[PDB]
Every structure is written in C-alpha cells, then in structure tokens.
C-alpha cells in the first residue's frame, strides 16, 4: 500500500518516509534552526513525488533515497564537508542538490547506485561530485537545465508530475 496526495512535513526527529505516490515532502518552517549533531534521513519506494528539503535538522550524517521513480528531488545539505547523499535505484528523476555552506570550494558528494535517466540541474555542476558505485572496482545521469520553479513545491508538482 502507498499513500496518495499527502503533503508530509519534515520535522526534527523524523528519519524515514516510505511508500509515497504523488506526494510531497518539505521541511517545516517551525522549530527551525535547532539541530542535532548527527542524523540520518531515509526515503524508500517513492513514485511521482516532490521531495523538497530546504532545511535539514541534523548537522552531520546522511540522506538516503532508495527505489524512487519519476520524482523531483531538491535538497539543501548542511555545511558538513563530509555530509553524505546516497541515491539508489532512481529512475527518471530531476535533481537539485545545493549545499548550505560558507566554504570556499564547497563540494557535495553524491553517491549513486543503479540510477537511470537522472537529471542533475546544470547550475549545480561545479559544486557536486557524483560517484557511481553501481559496480565498484553513462546514461545513469546527465547535467541539464530545467526550471526550478523558484523551489515552489506545488509548482514543481504541476510542472513535472
């Protein structure tokens, strides 16, 4: 069973969102700023959703997205140089990953595994390091321009879903 047409609001303490279809997930505007030292977020079985997290409520840790199709993924990762974003079994997703960092040559590593036809926004090219760990020692991803719709979650919903 999946849940349809629900807006999920990320709050501190939440760590998992699963079995979503034509849903949205966004960061809460309330209790903002307060963060835990370490955390982890996991998304699993996501279809035709908009994930738009402009605020993460842990300083260090990871975001995992697994089994995700035809979705929009906007993430604003913490400044933590070692922050992890691991993407597995993504198909036909548009991705905007930015890092909230005052660092000069700020880079966000993105680990991908078994992804296909993923589009990373071209604006993020110089800031991401994509490492394909599918079969560790081409059409997995590409960098293209697309309208980010002012990062308005429902506009993205209407534009791409």
Residue numbers in the entry: 101 to 237, 245 to 268
Question: What are the paper's exact sentences on this?
Answer:
activating protein (GAP) function of TBCC. homology domain (light green), and a β-sheet domain (dark green). interaction with TBCC (as determined by mass spectrometry). from each other, without dissociation from the TBC-DEG/TBCC platform. αβ-tubulin configuration and activate Arl2 GTP hydrolysis.
